[model samples]
Target: STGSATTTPIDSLDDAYITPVQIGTPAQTLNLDFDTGSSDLWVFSSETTASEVDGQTIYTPSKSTTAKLLSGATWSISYGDGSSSSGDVYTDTVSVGGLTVTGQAVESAKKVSSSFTEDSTIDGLLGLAFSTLNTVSPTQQKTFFDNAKASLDSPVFTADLGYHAPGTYNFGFIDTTAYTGSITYTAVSTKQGFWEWTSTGYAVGSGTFKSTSIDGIADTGTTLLYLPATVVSAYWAQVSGAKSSSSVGGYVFPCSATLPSFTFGVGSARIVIPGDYIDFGPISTGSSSCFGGIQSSAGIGINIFGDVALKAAFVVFNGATTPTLGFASK
Candidate 1:
């Protein structure tokens, strides 16, 4: 039918958003990262090394009668920083909000990266990307949304993330009341297993809007927005004392700099991101310079409209036969 859940930020930096999930019979709840950029529902489990887990919650699969080990199956997902996690699989009942899916594939993390250990707030990940990207071997498993979509009323879900605030994830149907004005839809490219789409163009402050095609992926799992180097250069050009710093790793500006708002195009519709929203934060504690939320995506190979972008609008992931992405201002 449908599902809904409240997602909250883990830290003041808005590093990641977490949603509570119910897994197995006599269900145990865990806070999980809802990652739209990846496709693998994995979690810390009893098998994970004690040293690998810090303050995060662990899924005790052995305690659930419905937990059935999927012998011979293994999964592993890695990051560019060489950080990763991997483990075996289990079929169990998993539910979010009001929707319940029977026999959902749950990856039990046997090993996790050090960075993850340091971030004790995240217990696991709930992947919303297409199942084609699943890391499970032998036979790829469907994502939680993929299996639950069949029973949903509209086969669509919406992500409403907020900066340093709680948000909601509504599945199966759109909640019109959650956004102001009408929603705009765009065709999505799933060839690469991401909700990839091309933005019409962008404008910096009151500057002229460029009519360029900026291809990017909508990744709720990511922390900031990354655009083409050209766009990034243009954005910081208006900021006083702002420059690309190799030591700081990217663009940084005086903490007191007057920032300009950013606006991007979706089809013919344009949504604006307030300047304050782009003021990510101080590059370092007590530092006089601050980091910009919109960074160059050149190194990433493709632009990524991460939480920084999503927080500015309400997005709908339509998983219909012809999947589509819809954006609306709040």
Candidate 2:
């Protein structure tokens, strides 16, 4: 098929600022995507037989000098969209960004889907964000951060993303620069998987969604910022001639109309998503639309705040690290 697109060659999508670690030795290092959306340290294993796997890379544990497979633990994980994989649990004296940690949890799935096994070109994922959502068992639960916390330099992790290089979710130590100003985070709702928050209100230019002071969650997994239907229609109402069209992924509106500026309220703190992102692509229903700022969720009952909101602010997930999450503008 497509050569580079068919088989991604990068061990890990890395930045010059990222610290690299060797899996077996200096000659054999594995690049990792430090994922915050889920908790799991995954790696491709060579023990995987064709019946159990599909993809370009299946790491051979035998080839590594410093790896240990779990004795009786087998693992499996499924996502909301029904995508999943199953594997064995193992511990290795792994190195990430030049830092070494022993007894780190990693997954070597026997069955991996094409999404993880195919589209993604890397070996595995390293989860460092704080979240109660996990695949750990009743008796033995372990996270990469849980095992390596004692050795980490600080109690912080940051995810810097580049959509230009999709499929490569890079993770490393937190970039201090990533945090700007004093962070204000609302209390977390004990819901599973979803990051929910209550919006004190929303201000789109002069119009706002402040009727009852909406409560919402911030989710990094999805790409769009979702709001209640009534709230969404209220937003477009602010635009000069906003109209819905199914052709532009169903959300494109007239960009020439000068999309309204919007903001999300959290207690006393507020974060803004400017007009540029609101004015999305030239996707045709014959014209572009206001695809980014905010839209309806088709009635999920809860508004899912997406990456469009995540990119503008520094989000600190505090499940394992602390009781309070911190957020601030960059």
Candidate 3:
């Protein structure tokens, strides 16, 4: 109960990091995306049709003597990016790093969208959000972290998400060495089952920090930063040849443009996304057009501090009585 676990990233398309998780009694390992945006620990399983699964590993519950079907229970989840997965439920042993949770609800996907099926390496998603957000019907399910929290010395987890590189996800304990400067604290409004907070203001380039309130969520499952259209336009204004392109999607500009750094104010602490990070690589192969990492959160009600922005800091997901978030420069 007083132990912790650490997960390292594996090679993935873009910066979506995957970590190995063991399920069942003997432990069937699968690589999964530890997403903080949602709450459901689902995996590709024997229940899945062969055609629906690509090169991904499937979890065979029958192989585990302890695996029990959660009768009358089912789960279906749809992500903001339009990816979806649905299936039956199973009660089994699930472990991350060295932390183990017995009788944990592990959703076995019988159906998945092409977005997930095509991502062969990502067997499934391990949701780290509040358990209140779990998608299981009949009864809600608890995440691995939630079940393990009672045993943990502190109900805390840390995300060291990387930028086109490796990162680490630590449970139970915070490793101070992974970050620098004093960790900034923010109260989280988990009414939506997300790690959400409001930044006091933001700035474009070297411009003065404008006092504009921004309500957003820290989503590890997402790939890029999504902000208000006005904020996005303000940031893009500083770059030459930048324009909102439908063909490329979102804002695009010359790859050679000197992008300016963007900063979001969190109390007196400022979380800055460097200019280089704002350039989300080329829009297309060999094209001089580059997509801006910060885009408009038009349809979505809340802004998202995706990997593009989260990677710039060491983030702590505090699951205390009153949920809070802590950020430190990495």
TM-score for each prediction? 0.98, 0.71, 0.95
Give one clash count per candidate, in the order shown. 0, 17, 1
- The digit string of per-residue lDDT tens for model 1 on 1-330 reads 999999999998788999999999889899999999999999999999999999999999999989999999999998544679999999999999879999899999999999988889999999999999999998899999999998999999999998789999999999989999989999999999999999999999999899999999999998888999999999999999999999988899999987899999999888888888788789989999999888998878889999988999999999999999999999
Residue-level lDDT of model 2, residues 166-225, one tens digit each, is: 322122334456556777868766555444557777777766446356766665544557
Off by over 4 Å in 3: 2-13
Model 2 TM-score is 0.71
Each model's Cα RMSD = 1.0, 6.9, 1.7
Candidate 3: give the clashing pairs. 1-151
Number of colliding residue pairs in model 3 = 1
Measured on C-alpha atoms, candidate 2 has an lDDT of 0.56
User: Which is the leading candidate under lDDT?
Assistant: 1
Best by TM-score: 1
Q: Evaluate all candidate structures by whole-model CA lDDT and list the values in order.
A: 0.92, 0.56, 0.87
Model 3, residue 307: distance off in Å is 0.9
Q: How far in Å is the alpha carbon of 40 misplaced in model 1?
A: 0.2
